[PDB]
Each structure stands twice: as structure tokens, then as C-alpha cells.
Write an enzyme that holds these catalytic residues in place. Structure first.
Site, PDB file in Angstrom:
ATOM      1  N   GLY A  17       2.642  -7.402  -0.496  1.00 37.68           N
ATOM      2  CA  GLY A  17       3.738  -7.935   0.307  1.00 37.68           C
ATOM      3  C   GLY A  17       4.715  -6.871   0.775  1.00 37.68           C
ATOM      4  N   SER A  18       5.520  -7.224   1.777  1.00 38.41           N
ATOM      5  CA  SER A  18       6.540  -6.346   2.349  1.00 38.41           C
ATOM      6  C   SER A  18       7.564  -7.165   3.144  1.00 38.41           C
ATOM      7  CB  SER A  18       5.906  -5.275   3.240  1.00 38.41           C
ATOM      8  OG  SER A  18       5.329  -5.853   4.397  1.00 38.41           O
ATOM      9  N   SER A  21      12.938  -3.466   3.859  1.00 39.95           N
ATOM     10  CA  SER A  21      13.035  -2.267   3.003  1.00 39.95           C
ATOM     11  C   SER A  21      12.374  -2.429   1.620  1.00 39.95           C
ATOM     12  CB  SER A  21      14.494  -1.788   2.861  1.00 39.95           C
ATOM     13  N   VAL A  24       5.972  -5.152  -2.323  1.00 38.66           N
ATOM     14  CA  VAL A  24       5.464  -5.623  -3.614  1.00 38.66           C
ATOM     15  C   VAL A  24       4.048  -5.103  -3.801  1.00 38.66           C
ATOM     16  CG1 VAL A  24       4.983  -7.587  -5.141  1.00 38.66           C
ATOM     17  CG2 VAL A  24       6.938  -7.684  -3.673  1.00 38.66           C
ATOM     18  N   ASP A 132      14.841 -22.803   1.511  1.00 39.98           N
ATOM     19  CA  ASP A 132      13.715 -22.387   2.324  1.00 39.98           C
ATOM     20  C   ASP A 132      12.416 -22.452   1.536  1.00 39.98           C
ATOM     21  OD1 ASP A 132      12.566 -19.510   4.143  1.00 39.98           O
ATOM     22  OD2 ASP A 132      12.877 -21.541   4.950  1.00 39.98           O
TER      23      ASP A 132
END
Ligand SMILES: O=C(NC1CC1)c1ccc(-c2cnc3c(NCc4cccs4)nccn23)cc1
Ligand SMILES: [Cl-]
Length: 258
Positions: A17-18, A21, A24, A132
Site C-alpha cells: 500500500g501507499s 507520504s 505499507v 469512511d
């Protein structure tokens, strides 16, 4: 490719993941155990951003002891330059699992719902409204679903959608725990019918319209589990005051009668 955190060393296997900044990574410790490390680069970060990440770490630490349906945080390191978080690695996120699945097992769908309710119940008791919720926010680890974040800092993208947005979130452009019930409802609808309630409306501007619209009616095809039908109907009530609460959902026959 390595990462060290408070003494200990880890081998990057895969980036999972990203976001803003942050990255993961799935990694291994020396004993060959699997973890997920989150890295945040703080170099070009607002005081607002810093405070949101500080707030995330504090809440994740605190909420450890209160439910094991919240991702485990094993350790963390924070300086002015970066943050590392050593957390549990899951088998698969719930979005990726729902997309791969043919038909959902009735007992496994109910087990997962229980898990989601417990996780969201827990954050509510500590004054957090996520706001969310999506399948991407839940992770399958061991036999259980765990919530991986709190909607406090920026969500990670895998390496968006309005399908789960509550009506009052759209109507408030001119925060309640009931908002999480809506989104949790939509995940359960997906788990039941194979689509989110408005997945048929491809246009996003048109999608926002049906969510707020009282005269648009969500269809509920009849099913063996009459309890499940009802849970879905009470979660997906447009008026938040009349929408079912988490503590009520926990006393509901769908979850209580086995
Ligand atoms: O940022 C997280 N939580 C905020 C409170 C700090 C966060 C992000 C990702 C994960 C995490 C931990 N494990 C996963 C995973 N596992 C499935 C995989 C996909 C690819 C390799 S493993 N997929 C997606 C996300 N995973 C845990 C916490
Ligand atoms: Cl509630």
C-alpha cells in the site's frame, strides 16, 4: 532491502500500500514471522498532518486492550523525520476477498458482520466516528475481520468510491455514529446480494443523487435469512435518527439467535 525499528531488523518482501507520504510493506523479522510495517515520511508534512498521525498512533495504542477486532500494533518509532509502525499482517483485505468470492457462506458472512460491529462499537466507545468505512478498511487475519484504521489520517491505496457514503454526509454541505451504521450496512448488502446498493449507477454525479433521494427506493430481494433482510433495511434508512444504532444491532436476532 531492509527496515530497522527500535533495534529490530526486517526484510521487505512486498509493498502492499501507499498514500500521502506513506508506504505499507509486508516484511519478515529475524525469526521469519510476517508483519506489516507502515512508513511515513514526515519531511514535507503540515502541522495538521503530523497531528493526525500522532492522533492515529495514540488511538491505535489505546484501542489495543479493548478489542482484538482492531489491528494489533506491536511497536512504533517516531522522530521528526519519519514514523514506523509494526502491525499485524493480514491474509487479504475484505475488498480483495469480496471481489474474488463466488458466493458468500451464510455462517461466514454473519461471523464477519459480528466482527465489524464489535470493531466499530469499540471506536465509538472511545469517541471515534470513522466516517469512511469500506471493505478496504477491514482485514482478514486468523479467522476474523479486523478494522485497520480510524479515518483519522489519510487512507492507504493498494499497490476511490462513493458507494458507502451516507446521505447525511452529502446533506451536510450547506458527526454522528449513525454514519458508520450506513456504511456498515452497505458492506453487509454487498456481502448478501453481491453488489453495493447503488453499484448499478456508474455515473458519480448521478450516484450522489440516489443516496440523498427519499423517492429512490433500495431494492431488497427476499432471502432465507429474514433477519438479515431486516438488518439491511434498518441500517439503510436515510434518516439517521430512525436508522438503527450499533448497540441495537448487537441485540438484533441476526446476531443473537443461533
Ligand atoms: O495504516 C494502517 N492503519 C492505520 C492505523 C494505522 C494499516 C494499513 C495496512 C495494514 C495491513 C496489514 N496487512 C494488510 C494486507 N494484507 C494482505 C496483503 C496484500 C499483499 C501482501 S499481504 N492488505 C492490506 C493492508 N494491510 C494495516 C494497517
Ligand atoms: Cl450508533
Amino acid at each position: 532491502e531492509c527496515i530497522s525499528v527500535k533495534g529490530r531488523i526486517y526484510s521487505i518482501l512486498k509493498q502492499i500500500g501507499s498514500g500521502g507520504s506513506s508506504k505499507v510493506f509486508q516484511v519478515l523479522n529475524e525469526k521469519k514471522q510476517i508483519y506489516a510495517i507502515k512508513y511515513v515520511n514526515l519531511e514535507e508534512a503540515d502541522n495538521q498532518t503530523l497531528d493526525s498521525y500522532r492522533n492515529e498512533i495514540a488511538y491505535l495504542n489505546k484501542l489495543q486492550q479493548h478489542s482484538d477486532k482492531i489491528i494489533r500494533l506491536y511497536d512504533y518509532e517516531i522522530t521528526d523525520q519519519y514514523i514506523y509502525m509494526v502491525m499485524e499482517c493480514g491474509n487479504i483485505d475484505l475488498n480483495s476477498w469480496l471481489k474474488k468470492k463466488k458466493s458468500i457462506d451464510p455462517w461466514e458472512r454473519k461471523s464477519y458482520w459480528k466482527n465489524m460491529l464489535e470493531a466499530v462499537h469499540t471506536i465509538h466507545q472511545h469517541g471515534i466516528v470513522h466516517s469512511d468505512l469500506k471493505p478496504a478498511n477491514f482485514l482478514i487475519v486468523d479467522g476474523m475481520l479486523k478494522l485497520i484504521d480510524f479515518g483519522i489520517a489519510n487512507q492507504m491505496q493498494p499497490d476511490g468510491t462513493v458507494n458507502y457514503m451516507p446521505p447525511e454526509a452529502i446533506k451536510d454541505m450547506s458527526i454522528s455514529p449513525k454514519s458508520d451504521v450506513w456504511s456498515l450496512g452497505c458492506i453487509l448488502y454487498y456481502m448478501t446480494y453481491g453488489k453495493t446498493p447503488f453499484q448499478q449507477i456508474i455515473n458519480q454525479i448521478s450516484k450522489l443523487h440516489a443516496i440523498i433521494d427519499p423517492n429512490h427506493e433500495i431494492e431488497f430481494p427476499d432471502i432465507p435469512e429474514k433477519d438479515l433482510q431486516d438488518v439491511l433495511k434498518c441500517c439503510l434508512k436515510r434518516d439517521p435518527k430512525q436508522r438503527i444504532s450499533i448497540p441495537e444491532l448487537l441485540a438484533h436476532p441476526y446476531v443473537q439467535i443461533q
